[model samples]
Target chain A: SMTIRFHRNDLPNLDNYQVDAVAIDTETLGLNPHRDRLCVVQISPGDGTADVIQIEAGQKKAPNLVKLLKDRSITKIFHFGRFDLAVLAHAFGTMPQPVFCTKIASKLTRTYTDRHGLKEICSELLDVSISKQQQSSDWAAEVLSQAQLEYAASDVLYLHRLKAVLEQRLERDGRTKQAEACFKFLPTRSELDLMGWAESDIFAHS
Target chain B: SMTIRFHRNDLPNLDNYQVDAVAIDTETLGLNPHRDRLCVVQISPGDGTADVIQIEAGQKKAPNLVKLLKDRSITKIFHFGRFDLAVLAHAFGTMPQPVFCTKIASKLTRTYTDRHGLKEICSELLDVSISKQQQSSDWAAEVLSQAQLEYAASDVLYLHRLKAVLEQRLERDGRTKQAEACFKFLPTRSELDLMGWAESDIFAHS
Candidate 1:
């Protein structure tokens, strides 16, 4: 998992991110190791804090982020990934990578309750308490506060941990095949046919 | 469980339906059940047959069927309902009521597969195979065929059986709560909150 670390002073800030490069296609990220690949950034409290946060992708200024996802190997981690996928797909044209949705994994596990949010699973399974502060904060704003960065970083941190838990369970259940099928849905390019809106109907009035 | 039977007759071939009965709604489907509900009828097969046929949805002739949908109280069944919901929401403006979808149930019970089409499910669960002769027929054609009526009826009939299979599985899984969650996704409410268009620069000159 790529570390999204911050000192207490740098806590919740977005301006700190320079967003050095973005790639929109396979040829763009370069021929090096991280080239043509999406990095897995896990957010969590670097310090022992109560808040929980998960940040995978879909940054606005990060145009290369498209190329970042072009390699399509980045398996994004989210709790209820649908809306995230929808929002990010719209923002980046490139689909969010395979979503290792912990909630979906919980459903597969037939966990005590079928309702598993990121906060809930992190606390229950990982023994990590997540913060809910500034959750609905405007992510599109130019600069993020110190608290916001920690929250966002925590989000990815738990996501990284959740991936291992779910992946192991999926492998153990002989349901890895099922996981493979479900994961197939994560590729954004695979959904292009479904998302394409034609010009003829764009303005048609029913 | 509702009974779903497959037919070989065309929708227009039947004396059972009136053109004026089909109603379309422009509000959330849950809110305008009778006013916006839709009955799904598909030409079963893909364009593999040599029928050289044309099938189309008539604008003026659709009102009667639209009326039938808006009359509340009537139960509407769908197989793999979301896309139908999207199409209906875009075309008619309202979500339908008591809308039962087999695919939703199948997924809830871990029985659904991407490869599972309505026809395949109907055959496995109800021993029914609907007509596919006009699957690729121009849906906007002026003329209707006997084959069309049969195709439409089977769509509903097979849905009935598919629902039963899923319902039984639901009971066995003890997932009534999860099934309820799936129901929450249907009905006349709009799940997506905001919509926006991409800027002109989004797809600017390459």
Candidate 2:
């Protein structure tokens, strides 16, 4: 059984969501930061529990969650941190720093397979089975279902473990520096995506 | 460049949704048919048009949709029809037949790569891109967003074209009968999944 807490308008006190380094993920109406709106923000402090903050589509001010994301002393871990960074930056006017992206780590180390999806990584590396059934679910529901809450929780639930295993693989494979480079570049990459370079590989040459 | 219409408790007349072979997909609260509730259904008739019907969690009677799904002559096509089959059967008390599933066809015919997801298949075979942003969105929302509607429409949009291309490949590879047999067995396969045999391959002996 998973422990999930629901919050509306603003997250609970800083003690609840603000941690040394929290695993974070955002649910949006669509991929385009400029086009779609943020629906919910899920945060886990590498624990077996999670906090789900349901944000209404046009609710611009989430003061507490915003503070947590912008806090530099606190690190933010995400599966694919770039898109989340961009979306969070757009919604809250700041990007979380000291970030770790599991995706970049997977690509740097899991060279044998081109599939680095969260599900693939979890199954291959952690031997954990996570249901993504609610991965594409409606986060904008007036009342979130238990399943949706659990699904949101799952996004951040395994990041702590994944970061551990993927970091080990990165060092063992001699790609730790390269992965770090990619991770450092993610905030700028997210900015580029938001600036309408989402589809193009700016590094790719014709 | 897409047209989408939403219907409420009553699906707009049979003429709007009923067709010879309509591409269909359902949105549910979660993956389990027994536990999750059916929320909305999207239908298209090989045209660049679609109708989304929102089904309330407890309100079970969808007379018009039931007629269309139960009509033997009106073929029901889906991308991955098994889950839809089980959920629809539970919600409406009937299973639509004469079905075509694009996922099954992709697996049977497109043996080049192991990836047969809707997005991958569309990108590979049709050269069209579809966003799955709303794939897990709240289908039970009082009002569906335009993005959600577009996502639902995208599910059934290329299905007809995919079916056509996959059918040709199936015939060329002489796996048409084999593919048809799989489609025929999908309903039962879905039943097995609901019966707690979801993870076990029934064909495999212990």
Off by over 4 Å in 1: A1-63, A134-136, A186-206, B1-206
Across residues A66-86, which tens digit of lDDT does each residue of candidate 1 receive? 343443554555655543444
Q: How close is candidate 1 to the true structure, as a TM-score?
A: 0.38
The chain B TM-scores of all candidates, as shown, are 0.57, 0.93
- In candidate 2, position A116 carries an lDDT of 90
TM-score of each: 0.38, 0.51
Per-prediction share of native contacts kept: 0.00, 0.00
State each candidate's clash count: 72, 8
The alpha-carbon lDDT assigned to residue B55 of candidate 2 equals: 86
- Residue B195 in candidate 1 has what lDDT? 12
- C-alpha RMSD over true interface residues, each candidate: 14.4, 12.2
Worst 10 residues of 1 chain A by lDDT: A21-30
